[PDB]
Design a protein around this motif. Structure first.
Motif, PDB file in Angstrom:
ATOM      1  N   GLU A  19       2.717   1.790  -3.229  1.00 54.44           N
ATOM      2  CA  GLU A  19       1.941   2.186  -4.262  1.00 54.44           C
ATOM      3  C   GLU A  19       1.385   3.598  -4.090  1.00 54.44           C
ATOM      4  O   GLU A  19       1.217   4.089  -5.085  1.00 54.44           O
ATOM      5  N   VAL A  20       1.034   4.079  -2.872  1.00 55.40           N
ATOM      6  CA  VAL A  20       0.715   5.425  -2.699  1.00 55.40           C
ATOM      7  C   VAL A  20       2.109   6.306  -3.404  1.00 55.40           C
ATOM      8  O   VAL A  20       1.545   7.423  -3.864  1.00 55.40           O
ATOM      9  N   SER A  21       3.305   5.930  -3.026  1.00 47.71           N
ATOM     10  CA  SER A  21       4.512   6.868  -3.728  1.00 47.71           C
ATOM     11  C   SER A  21       4.410   6.602  -5.299  1.00 47.71           C
ATOM     12  O   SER A  21       4.725   7.684  -5.976  1.00 47.71           O
ATOM     13  N   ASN A  22       4.239   5.199  -5.677  1.00 47.13           N
ATOM     14  CA  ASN A  22       4.069   4.939  -7.138  1.00 47.13           C
ATOM     15  C   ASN A  22       3.245   5.533  -7.843  1.00 47.13           C
ATOM     16  O   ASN A  22       3.233   5.541  -9.085  1.00 47.13           O
ATOM     17  N   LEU A  23       2.153   6.074  -7.262  1.00 47.96           N
ATOM     18  CA  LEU A  23       1.026   6.939  -7.828  1.00 47.96           C
ATOM     19  C   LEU A  23       1.651   8.155  -8.620  1.00 47.96           C
ATOM     20  O   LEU A  23       1.028   8.855  -9.458  1.00 47.96           O
ATOM     21  N   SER A  24       2.937   8.494  -8.427  1.00 46.80           N
ATOM     22  CA  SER A  24       3.674   9.559  -9.028  1.00 46.80           C
ATOM     23  C   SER A  24       3.844   9.171 -10.532  1.00 46.80           C
ATOM     24  O   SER A  24       3.924  10.160 -11.290  1.00 46.80           O
ATOM     25  N   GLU A  25       3.761   8.011 -10.944  1.00 46.68           N
ATOM     26  CA  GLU A  25       3.907   7.402 -12.078  1.00 46.68           C
ATOM     27  C   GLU A  25       2.876   8.031 -13.164  1.00 46.68           C
ATOM     28  O   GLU A  25       3.092   8.350 -14.171  1.00 46.68           O
ATOM     29  N   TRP A  26       1.967   8.665 -12.691  1.00 45.08           N
ATOM     30  CA  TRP A  26       0.670   9.200 -13.181  1.00 45.08           C
ATOM     31  C   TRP A  26       0.622  10.568 -13.227  1.00 45.08           C
ATOM     32  O   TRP A  26      -0.028  11.446 -13.947  1.00 45.08           O
ATOM     33  N   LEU A  27       1.430  11.282 -12.453  1.00 37.85           N
ATOM     34  CA  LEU A  27       1.441  12.794 -12.042  1.00 37.85           C
ATOM     35  C   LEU A  27       2.344  13.518 -12.888  1.00 37.85           C
ATOM     36  O   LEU A  27       3.456  12.808 -13.306  1.00 37.85           O
ATOM     37  N   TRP A  74       0.831  -1.339   0.003  1.00 37.99           N
ATOM     38  CA  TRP A  74       0.034  -0.136  -0.067  1.00 37.99           C
ATOM     39  C   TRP A  74       0.813   1.295  -0.037  1.00 37.99           C
ATOM     40  O   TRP A  74       0.803   1.900  -1.232  1.00 37.99           O
TER      41      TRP A  74
END
Lengths: 15, 117
Positions: free
Chosen positions: A6-14, A3
């Motif tokens: 993947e909160v940090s990996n959400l930057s892939e989309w930012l 979790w």
């Protein structure tokens, strides 16, 4: 753990 | 466009696949595939649909027990206990996409806490 990971990996989309 | 439902259009939806071996399946709004739409029904149900296909569907009622949401700008990450998926709202500008996300967070937040990183 995955979790938090993947909160940090959400930057892939930012800009 | 009822008083029965709230809907927002998504740029993209990513299903986490590990819970060959892909990590994500990523869906986008297409003219052939169909528009990506996030729907919350006033009764408390959450859907993501691409055209007619339902990609996500569950109740937000008593979801504090098993659902986590986190917002980063115009994106949301959803975790259910296990399943995980992320969503980015659409708009002509970064601002309109964030406006869309925020209006959605305002509905989600009646049922569950939407956290920051």
């Amino acid at each position: 753990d995955l979790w938090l990971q993947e909160v940090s990996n959400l930057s892939e989309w930012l800009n | 466009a009822m008083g029965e439902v709230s809907q927002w259009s998504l740029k993209r939806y990513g299903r986490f696949m590990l819970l060959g071996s892909p990590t994500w399946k990523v869906f986008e709004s297409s003219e052939e595939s169909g528009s990506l739409v996030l729907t919350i029904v006033v009764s408390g149900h959450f859907f993501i649909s691409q055209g007619q296909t339902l990609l996500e569907g569950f109740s937000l009622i008593g979801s504090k027990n098993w659902l986590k949401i986190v917002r980063r700008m115009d994106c949301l990450l959803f975790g259910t206990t296990s399943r995980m998926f992320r969503v980015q709202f659409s708009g002509e500008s970064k601002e309109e996409a964030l406006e869309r996300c925020c209006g959605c967070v305002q509905t989600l937040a009646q049922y569950v806490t939407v956290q920051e990183p």
